[PDB]
């Protein structure tokens, strides 16, 4: 193989694993063209996004099919469904594989010959291959032991000119910094306890948020046992990871444990092999959101207030009732020490394969995969009202505006059960004739995927702190859910070959899906690929390799479960910041479901065209790969937005084409190569063009992907790229000038929201170098992604709270918005006049909260960055030093990842590699005070026995 006719990239485990990330995928961030890999956050155990040649699924499955040996792997993600108030992320299914077990990873990027793995392969395929057997010297035990620290990478750049206050006036209790310019004078602050109050010099504490963090620590232990014979091999491994990240206390926690055992035995023509793996994880998360969460509470601090001085709870002034500010936030050390959001998961997966060769040229293969997971969430928060409301300022002293109302406690638990089964029966035929070569494959596929869970919640805790379903004198809330889907297919793949110069492949697959209408389950998709190596049978010896590539083909797809028939739900009503649910009052009720089913659905069909060129020179000391692709995903079934006046808010129908076109370019060479020293350079370049082509006209040409009510929202619009943003901009006169309010000075909102950019990078690229001098290695990779925009609540809260350096704009003196007019409206006469009204000192706080002249759009932030992704310094010890020792090899290794990030002038707020909305499409909307990203660096010891 590498008679392939479309883009693919091979990486061996040593590159996968040298980075010592807990995860098989995050090390490859920015190292492979057309493969956009990103982490959801720096929080331990969180998910990893991997999008291949853009987004095709409008909602919302764009990860590639992970295939392990080679059985599909479950890649389900566990993250919060309300990112605004309780954001958290607990991992995705691929994060479970142990990188130390990977021999080879091969990423199939194109979607024109996917007959082997089925519909899920249109999103691309990540083929992993795990290590097998020896013989070697001597016993076959490899240990990897690691230790690494994480510190905070980029916090927003703050103003240190003005302190606690509002309206530019001094205050003793604000969650913000619109006070006077720093005096050094002694002023009061905080609440009053026992007729006493704290008194401090009015100065800035620029390190206060930075000092709040610790150093994350992580220790890893990995072992493996290996051996083989001429008829058999055996591999058995174990990995352990325990992360307590940089946010104080143990709320950033991730414990990973894996165990694997893989064997193969050959007896004649028969080969039976088997792989079985168990995975454990315990995630704990420092919850994000706009309420009583840690980071939201942390950003809402005056520039003069000492944060680390708030951790001592034996200081009454830090107790929740006397905390220095009562404005929708709480003592961050209380929230981390007293809230709960834990996840524990147990997972078993594996495969059985029976190979049997017969009649010279044939081979029968039966392969069966099973992957099952039991996960269990436990979240809780105290009855803040019972504990702290009566008698305190923060408190009864706030009445209905107290952060303790109605915070009466809550505790929920959920147990999820996932299960997928895959079965393949195949027959292969491989026979050479007169320089030709024939390879046929006929197969059957059978798939069964099932998820269910059981949820149960109690509110209003009797004992304030105990988190148990017994601890409430009120009704408990229960929910139960289950989905099941089945698929069967038959496929064939014909490989034609002439003299290792002309390679041809024809793929065909027909599937029958349970999620399509009964009268239309069957879809067929063919493909064709070609490869012409004009190197061979072209003298020199200057051209090591020269291969030209082309592909055209289709991959069909079905829909998500239960989208054909109408349902009736238990009646509920979604109101702002709440619900009204049945039963009421003693009566149960059912309501007509808001998503109109459809039995006219037809299958989805992705069609792709691709051509590519691969050449090497000077004995592989120069090498480049270029691909050009044109991808159209059509008839994708999607719950399309609809006018509620129709009786439904969405209708399931086949969409139009989502198009992804672009260029994938890779260039590498070895400019210097001696006996003891080599220097390599690698440069890879991706540019993708995204365009929704049509969305069914009859319902409008627009549909929400994610978005705030009356706030910034990300759409899919007909003739525009995936992920268009709209946000409130200010009104302008026909001549460009900004309209402001005659009386306040503040900008005036335009009539409609303005389009404000899309989610997509205009281009992506990475540059690597690798030095080897005798035993020493060095690797330096840069990630470069440019273009696009994302919503950032970190800029939002720091504008509003008066803490971002931008808000110090005019030395906070009364100011007239430059270029301002007033719109003089008399009935239907519109007239514009130079604006004379200043924004007063007392109202400047509101100018910036709303987003200055930019209004809401101010908080769409540029996605672009250059990143020092990773640096790995390896020292393989000379084999001579190990001789009177039990050791076969020893490699010490120092490394660092996510080390430094460079953003354009306009973004001084976030590491753009952030979300609160998951690892797929909806995550691209932005970050909702996701926790700060971290800088990671450690050591690793490798010891072969």
């Amino acid at each position: 193989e590498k008679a392939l006719g479309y883009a693919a990239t091979s990486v061996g485990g040593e590159k996968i694993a040298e980075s010592r990330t807990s995860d098989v995928m995050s090390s490859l961030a920015g190292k492979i063209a057309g493969v956009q890999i990103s982490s959801t956050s720096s929080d331990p155990g969180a998910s990893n996004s991997v999008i291949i040649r853009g987004v095709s699924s409008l909602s919302g499955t764009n990860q590639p099919l992970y295939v392990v040996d080679g059985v599909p792997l479950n890649n389900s993600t566990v993250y919060s469904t309300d990112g605004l108030n309780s954001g958290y992320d607990f991992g995705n299914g691929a994060n479970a594989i142990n990188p130390d077990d990977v021999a080879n990873m091969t990423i199939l990027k194109g979607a024109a010959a996917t007959a082997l793995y089925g519909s899920r392969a249109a999103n691309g395929v990540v083929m992993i291959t795990t290590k097998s057997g020896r013989k070697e010297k001597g016993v076959g035990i490899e240990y990897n032991g690691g230790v690494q620290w994480s510190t905070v990478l980029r916090l927003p750049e703050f103003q240190n000119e003005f302190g606690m206050g509002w309206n530019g006036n001094h205050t003793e209790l604000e969650n913000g910094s619109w006070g006077p310019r720093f005096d050094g004078s002694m002023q009061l602050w905080g609440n009053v306890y026992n007729n006493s109050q704290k008194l401090k010099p009015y100065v800035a504490m620029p390190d206060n948020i930075k000092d709040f963090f610790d150093a994350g620590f992580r220790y890893s232990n990995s072992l493996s046992f290996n051996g083989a014979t001429d008829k058999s091999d055996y591999y058995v491994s174990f990995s352990q990871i325990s992360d307590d990240g940089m946010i104080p206390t143990d709320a950033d926690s991730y414990d990973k444990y894996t165990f694997s055992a893989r064997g193969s035995h050959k007896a004649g023509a028969l080969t039976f092999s088997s792989s079985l793996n168990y995975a454990y994880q315990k995630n704990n998360f420092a919850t994000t959101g706009q309420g009583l969460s840690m980071l939201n509470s942390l950003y809402q601090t005056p520039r003069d207030i000492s944060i680390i001085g708030l951790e001592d709870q034996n200081d009454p002034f830090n107790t929740p009732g006397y905390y220095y500010t009562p404005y929708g936030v709480m003592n961050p050390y209380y929230i981390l020490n007293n809230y709960l959001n834990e996840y524990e998961s147990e997972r078993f997966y594996g495969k059985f394969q029976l190979d049997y060769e017969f009649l010279k040229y044939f081979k029968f293969t039966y392969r069966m995969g099973l992957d099952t997971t039991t996960g269990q969430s436990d979240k809780g928060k105290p009855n803040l009202y019972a504990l702290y409301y009566e008698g305190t300022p923060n408190g009864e002293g706030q009445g209905s505006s107290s952060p303790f109302s109605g915070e009466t406690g809550q505790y929920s638990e959920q147990i999820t059960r996932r299960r997928e089964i895959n079965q393949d029966i195949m027959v292969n035929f491989n026979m050479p004739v007169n320089d030709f070569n024939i390879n046929a494959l006929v197969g059957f596929n059978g798939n069964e995927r099932k998820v269910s869970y059981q949820y149960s919640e109690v509110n209003d805790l009797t004992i304030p702190t105990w988190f148990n379903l017994k601890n409430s004198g009120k009704t408990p809330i229960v929910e139960q859910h289950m989905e099941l889907r089945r698929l069967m297919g038959v496929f064939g793949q014909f490989e034609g070959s002439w003299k290792n110069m002309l390679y041809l492949t024809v793929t065909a697959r027909n599937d029958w899906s349970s999620t399509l209408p009964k009268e239309n389950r069957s879809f067929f998709y063919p493909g064709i690929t070609g490869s012409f190596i004009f190197s061979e049978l072209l003298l020199q010896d200057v051209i090591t390799f020269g291969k030209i590539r082309a592909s055209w083909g289709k991959t069909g797809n079905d829909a998500d479960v239960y989208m054909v028939n109408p349902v009736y739900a238990q009646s509920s009503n979604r109101i702002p910041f709440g619900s009204l649910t049945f039963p009421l009052g003693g009566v149960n009720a059912y309501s007509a479901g808001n998503v109109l089913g459809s039995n006219t659905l037809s299958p989805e069909m992705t069609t792709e065209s691709e051509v590519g060129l691969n050449m090497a020179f000077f004995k592989n000391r120069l090498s480049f790969d270029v691909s050009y692709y044109n991808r159209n995903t059509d008839k994708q079934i999607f719950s399309l937005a609809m006018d509620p006046a129709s009786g439904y808010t969405a209708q399931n129908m086949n969409l139009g084409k989502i198009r992804n076109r672009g260029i994938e370019l890779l260039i590498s060479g070895t400019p210097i190569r001696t006996k003891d020293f080599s220097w390599e350079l690698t440069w890879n370049f991706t540019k993708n063009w995204s365009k929704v082509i049509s969305l069914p006209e009859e319902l409008g040409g627009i549909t929400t992907i994610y978005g705030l009510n009356g706030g910034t929202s990300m759409y899919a619009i007909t003739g525009m790229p995936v992920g268009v943003f709209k946000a409130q901009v200010a009104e302008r006169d026909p001549q460009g000038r900004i309209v402001v309010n005659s009386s306040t000075g503040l900008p005036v909102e335009a009539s409609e929201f303005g389009i404000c950019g899309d989610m997509n990078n205009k281009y992506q690229m990475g540059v690597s170098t690798n030095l080897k001098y005798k035993g020493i290695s060095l690797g330096i990779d840069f990630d470069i992604r440019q273009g696009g925009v994302m919503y950032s609540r970190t800029k939002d809260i720091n504008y509003f709270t008066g803490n971002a350096i931008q808000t110090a704009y005019n030395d906070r003196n009364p100011l007239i918005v430059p270029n301002s007019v007033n719109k003089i409206v008399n009935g239907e006469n519109v007239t514009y006049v130079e604006n004379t009204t200043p924004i007063t000192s007392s109202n400047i706080y509101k100018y910036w909260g709303d987003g200055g002249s930019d209004m809401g759009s101010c908080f769409l932030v540029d996605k672009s960055y250059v990143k020092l992704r990773s640096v790995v310094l390896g020292w393989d010890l000379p084999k001579r030093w190990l001789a009177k020792t039990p050791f076969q090899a020893v490699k010490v290794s120092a490394y660092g990842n996510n080390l430094f990030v460079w953003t354009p002038s306009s973004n001084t707020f976030i590491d753009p590699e952030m979300t609160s909305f998951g690892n797929d499409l909806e995550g691209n909307y932005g970050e909702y005070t996701a926790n700060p990203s971290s800088r990671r660096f450690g050591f690793n010891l490798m010891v072969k026995f």
Binding site: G83, N175, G176, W178, I705, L708, G710, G711, Y845
Partner: peptide, 10 residues
């Protein structure tokens, strides 16, 4: 689109 958010104290 769906979800909504609060404002702040001040």
């Amino acid at each position: 689109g769906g979800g909504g958010g609060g404002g702040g104290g001040g």
